[PDB]
RNA sequence: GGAACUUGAGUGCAGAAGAGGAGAGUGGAAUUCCACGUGUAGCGGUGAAAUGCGUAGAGAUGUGGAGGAACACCAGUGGCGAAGGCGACUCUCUGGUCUGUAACUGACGCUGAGGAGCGAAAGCGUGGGGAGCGAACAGGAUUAGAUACCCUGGUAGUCCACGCCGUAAACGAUGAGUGCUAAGUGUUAGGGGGUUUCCGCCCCUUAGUGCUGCAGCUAACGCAUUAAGCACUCCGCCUGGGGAGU
RNA sequence: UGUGAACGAUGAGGAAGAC
């Protein structure tokens, strides 16, 4: 087991309820993977120097979890299936 | 890789002659201290003194130097070497550099100078020549 | 990796002494575990030529250490290779 | 894998066969077996519309619901079996209902893996979910042209397809050899390219194995009598002197388009002939 | 002989940063041209500058900073 | 051969960084093509030109889409790796190196014919890919001739996957290991200390690596604690040129 | 105050034989 920090972007235009749906979904997946919570923060809306698909800005969101080591391998594709999410990255925590 | 401590001590004393430092250190062995005592008898070197530290070592050798500059020894070489055994019958031993030079020949009676070896009529391995 | 707990378990089982951190026993044991993991790693990918040559070096190490162990105490050696099931 | 044969005989010199490693059980389930009378390529009138067909080994069809009309019900891959009818291997799958249906088998599938046919199903290989839910660029197989019709597209082994993107109507798809069509968004499809890619590499190595296929030999056209073939006649290996290489039927074959210039599918052809 | 102008100013108030979570200091590292400043100005040791390099690349992965802009 | 020792060596503990290897995913810029908008006689190329592209509306510009290849700037006689060689990012597995009190093993070391593995680029076999670049080749120029240097194109190749081939100025034209031998001035990562909480200055000690130079070596050029210096151990190799690496 | 040397990496000024 090891620590992990993860960032991901959700769509700026999304309704707050649907945002609650995708966040409870990402949390249910994150706990399905056995990734224990350590801490989290909400960067929220921020302007972008460049668009990814088209959007001029995005909702940043981050999590910090103690976990495998096996889970990220399943978490990535499940982070790929959703059209609502834009980007996701999982960096190891070794400050 | 430390193939032979004695030849190493010989390149130590030769390099020491080249650098003209007053003294240098060598790892201990009775084989080394005996021939060093032989050089002490020959007088080419001023003094040798061991200093104990666990386990082996460390001898400190003081090079002698002439009153009018000049290296005390004009040459030094170890004819004996691993991968090429050498032997010498008691009458067969050369008198290197004629009368000035002396052989260092280990024998059954112990390490001996070519004069003492000729007197004892004892042959043995020729460790090195110094001149 | 191997994980640190597995090392602590692997060492204590084979020590001849209460604090025998060294010894050809424990050395060949830890190197054996490294050989097994690296061998399975070679099985995962045949393209790992560097892991392969490194494995060859570690085989040189095990061969030299077991050779000297044959040179010293044949009884401890046969008991050890019987314990591990290795060596021909 | 491919097992090369030692040249013990002249037919051994080139013949090769696939490893059959995917196969698990020697025999098909009795419940889904179906008869296959060999037409031999003849018309119902009895005339041979298609040249050099029939004479092959006997075959027995296994029922396969490409449509996958049921949904929301998890399945399981019990076994995999050889299919004489096509290059693609068949993999039997046991539904939670206790229903059993042979299904097309993408490579890399493992025995006992769960498979849901529903829209909510995961991208993981062997699943079949509607194109609207499919992420762009993922490989897809057994694509239907219309819902409920079955997946005529990409049934043969080793073939693949990719999504260039999608609108509400219609989803884009890269058909094999680079052609593209706006397939209906509502239409169902199955992620993951079909296995047995090594089938193309297989070498027959003798005339005798072809008889079992059974691919009947085709006479070269120049050899044929002039009354029978346009390229016939001449005093031994006649040059294709006559203008425009030709089929025994009057339409030219080399580089001549056989497409109808007016067709319902022409609107759907965003791209054609990449070569 | 010898001293560099505008050297470091990081170890003096470091260290272990960031690795990339901050945006203000990375906004300090970026030039008007949008590229990382040379060690001749930044003053950092090459190891710190390279860990900073991979860190800012991670920031570009976070899209917290422009990849390219006007000069 | 018996009995011992830790300094050679190995292992451990505590740390240190590295384009190291392989697998998977992902990134943005640009070239090119396609689609449309805009707008019109040039565009492109050379020493000069012409071939070529363009009123069937190019080039240019705006937007969108597609595909492949490479990773700018960071980047540094920087780093890693045995060599060859490795330069976007993330993750997965994993090799190697260095430092430090110091635990343990107690010579368990070095080299190494045969043998085995790796081994640039080009090439060959099979299946894919092919944006650009580009042998062969086509055309236009240059010239007495131009089977070239130049330009406009362009196949194989260059790319991937599974194999073969095992050649390079594969060079540092300097084999590997170890000991010793003035120094100096940087850097690459560590360790200790002498004031200072720190910052930071100073001194010392390891290993990597750049240059300048004392002794010493030299046909000369030069080398020079990274010897080609003084020594040791082992392997590879040389015996006039051409004929002939035939 | 500041002289040469040295390294790693360039930007471009054009067509023509032999004894």
Swiss-Prot record, chain A:
The answer, when asked if Ribonucleoprotein is one of the entry's keywords, is yes
Q: Which UniProt keywords apply?
A: Ribonucleoprotein, Ribosomal protein, RNA-binding, rRNA-binding
Inducers of expression: Strongly expressed during exponential growth, decreases 2-4-fold in stationary phase, part of the rpsF-ssbA-rpsR operon. The operon is induced by DNA damage by mitomycin C.
GO MF, one term, reads: small ribosomal subunit rRNA binding
Instruction: Write out the GO cellular component annotations.
Output: cytoplasm; ribonucleoprotein complex; ribosome
Query: What this chain does, per the record?
Result: Binds together with bS18 to 16S ribosomal RNA.
Question: How would you summarize the oligomeric state and partners of this protein?
Answer: Part of the 30S ribosomal subunit.
The name this protein goes by in its record? Small ribosomal subunit protein bS6
**Natural source organism:** Bacillus subtilis (strain 168)
List the taxonomic lineage.
Bacteria, Bacillati, Bacillota, Bacilli, Bacillales
What gene codes for this chain? Answer: rpsF
UniProtKB/Swiss-Prot annotation, chain B:
The organism's superkingdom is given as Bacteria
- What's a single GO MF annotation on this record? rRNA binding
- InterPro entries xrefs: Ribosomal_uS8, Ribosomal_uS8_CS, Ribosomal_uS8_sf
Tell me which UniProt keywords the record has, alphabetically: Ribonucleoprotein, Ribosomal protein, RNA-binding, rRNA-binding
- Give the UniProt entry's GO cellular component terms: cytosolic small ribosomal subunit
SUPFAM superfamilies given for it?
A: Ribosomal protein S8
Q: Which Pfam families match?
A: Ribosomal_S8
- Give GO BP annotations, semicolon-separated: translation
Question: What function does this protein fulfil?
Answer: One of the primary rRNA binding proteins, it binds directly to 16S rRNA central domain where it helps coordinate assembly of the platform of the 30S subunit.
Q: What quaternary structure, including any partners, is listed in this protein's UniProt entry?
A: Part of the 30S ribosomal subunit. Contacts proteins S5 and S12.
Q: Which family does this protein fall into?
A: Belongs to the universal ribosomal protein uS8 family.
Full protein name: Small ribosomal subunit protein uS8
Native species of this protein?
Bacillus subtilis (strain 168)
UniProtKB/Swiss-Prot annotation, chain D:
Q: Give a yes or no for keyword Lipid biosynthesis in this entry.
A: no
Q: One GO molecular-function annotation for this sequence?
A: transferase activity
Q: Where is this region: Disordered?
A: 218-275
Query: Which SMART domains does this UniProt record tie to the protein?
Result: Ribosomal_L2, Ribosomal_L2_C
What are the Basic residues biased-composition ranges? 257-275
Keyword Ribosomal protein attached: yes
Q: Which family does it belong to?
A: Belongs to the universal ribosomal protein uL2 family.
| Quaternary organization | Part of the 50S ribosomal subunit. Forms a bridge to the 30S subunit in the 70S ribosome.
**What's this protein's name?**
Large ribosomal subunit protein uL2
Query: From which organism does this entry originate?
Result: Bacillus subtilis (strain 168)
Q: What is the lineage of its organism?
A: Bacteria, Bacillati, Bacillota, Bacilli, Bacillales
- Provide the gene name from the record: rplB
From Swiss-Prot, chain E:
Which UniProt keywords are given for this protein, alphabetically ordered?
Ribonucleoprotein, Ribosomal protein, RNA-binding, rRNA-binding
* Record's keyword annotation contains Ribosomal protein: yes
Note the InterPro entries from the entry. Ribosomal_bS18, Ribosomal_bS18_CS, Ribosomal_bS18_sf
UniProt keyword Ribonucleoprotein, yes or no: yes
State the source organism's domain of life. Bacteria
User: What is the induction comment?
Assistant: Strongly expressed during exponential growth, decreases 2-4-fold in stationary phase, part of the rpsF-ssbA-rpsR operon. The operon is induced by DNA damage by mitomycin C.
Q: Gene Ontology cellular component?
A: cytosolic small ribosomal subunit
Q: Name one GO molecular function term.
A: structural constituent of ribosome
The alphabetized list of GO BP terms reads: translation
Q: How does it assemble?
A: Part of the 30S ribosomal subunit. Forms a tight heterodimer with protein bS6.
Summary of the function given for this chain in its UniProt record? Binds as a heterodimer with protein bS6 to the central domain of the 16S rRNA, where it helps stabilize the platform of the 30S subunit.
Task: Name the protein family.
Answer: Belongs to the bacterial ribosomal protein bS18 family.
Under what name is this protein listed? Small ribosomal subunit protein bS18
Q: What is the lineage of its organism?
A: Bacteria, Bacillati, Bacillota, Bacilli, Bacillales
